[PDB]
Amino acid sequence: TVLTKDRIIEIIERKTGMSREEIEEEIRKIMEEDPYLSEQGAAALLAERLGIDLIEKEVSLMRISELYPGMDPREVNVVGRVLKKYPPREYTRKDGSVGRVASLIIYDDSGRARVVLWDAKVSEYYNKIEVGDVIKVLDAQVKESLSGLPELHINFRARIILNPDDPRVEMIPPLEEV
Amino acid sequence: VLTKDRIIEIIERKTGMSREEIEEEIRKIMEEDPYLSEQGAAALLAERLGIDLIEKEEVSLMRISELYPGMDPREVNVVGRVLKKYPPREYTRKDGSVGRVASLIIYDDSGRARVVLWDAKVSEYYNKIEVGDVIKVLDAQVKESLSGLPELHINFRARIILNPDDPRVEMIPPLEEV
Ligand SMILES: [Cl-]
């Protein structure tokens, strides 16, 4: 990841509640264990051990209401709280094989979107996501759902960050308000 | 042991699906397997959704201030908001093997407690928990901390419910007030 050591420490403080002094002591222990790590690399390893998923390169003000079918997946960068999780199901490929697909409904301060997890993304994320959790979606293909809602398609080329550190998260209404 | 109606209520809470949507999923499972009862089909749906059904999730008025070392783990039923999460660590067992252990600090309207996740409980819950989340702790052993205060030990017997449906939750102060 290209995130600086200070940015990683800021994310760790927000996600763990540890003081800066406690976090620095954890980084020192990691560096004492591995002399090849830089301070940034040690901070990234600490984030990983804490179950914090860091994006390789970080920002966007984009809202769900701004998504449109066929937009460049490189422009897709939205956050949303999970409102609904539907059961995973099987689908048949043109080659005759069977894959997996699972759908969720997420929302931000602007609207809702269906999020479609494909194949390994179901095994990778489906049980990790809970209703009320916030996800950040990157590099997803956008399709028009039969409903009208934008559809974010999460395949092996897309990225999901569970409970991201992002300024848009605080503007998403809580579940009770929806 | 949980009734079909109780399983549907848990599925509604954990997925946000409507009762009508859940019933339709149970119908599909029953149409696939004629040997399942309605309760068995609801339990299979919960399992496919990644929901672990806790057979004893009773209500209690118990507070963290009422915990004492050596109290009956069957009486242990407390809720708390997560204030701090420390990194998972390795520890050495009496047999020479290496296990994992991770600690959190939680608090309710009455006080704070260290929560210690042992071995598979770290893999099972640690990444699912975040600061500000509320957890319900059941069947944990209570030990005296190095400062003479009660700590909750989450071993094989213990259970944790993430963001529980419990009347005590609304009484826990938000992070900003602490
Ligand atoms: Cl919420």
Residue numbers in the entry:
A (entry chain B): 2 to 59, 61 to 180
B (entry chain A): 3 to 180
Excerpt from the publication:
Replication Protein A (RPA) is a heterotrimeric single stranded DNA-binding protein with essential roles in DNA replication, recombination and repair. In Archaea, the same function is also fulfilled by a heterotrimeric RPA. We find that archaeal and eukaryotic RPAs share a conserved heterotrimerization core, which is composed of three OB domains connected through a three-helix bundle formed by a C-terminal α-helix from each subunit.
To gain insights into the contacts between AROD and OB-1, the crystal structure of the Rpa1 N-terminal domains AROD-OB-1 was determined at 1.8 Å resolution. AROD folds into a three-helix bundle, which is stabilized by a conserved hydrophobic core, and is connected to OB-1 by a 9-aa linker. AROD is an acidic domain, which contains 10 solvent-exposed glutamic acid residues out of 56 residues. The high-resolution view of the AROD-OB-1 interface shows that all three helices of AROD contribute to the interaction with OB-1. The chemical nature of the interactions at the interface is diverse and includes networks of direct and water-mediated buried polar contacts, as well as contacts between hydrophobic residues. Remarkably, the interface includes three salt bridges that involve two acidic residues (E23 and E27) and one basic residue (K17) from AROD. To test the effect of the disruption of this interaction on the DNA-binding properties of OB-1, we compared the binding of wild-type AROD-OB-1 and a triple mutant (K17A-E23A-E27A) to a surface-immobilized poly-dT35 ssDNA by BLI. Altogether, these results show that interaction with AROD modulates the DNA-binding activity by OB-1. Consistently, the structure reveals that AROD binds next to the DNA-binding site of OB-1, with its solvent-exposed glutamic acid residues pointing toward the DNA-binding cleft.
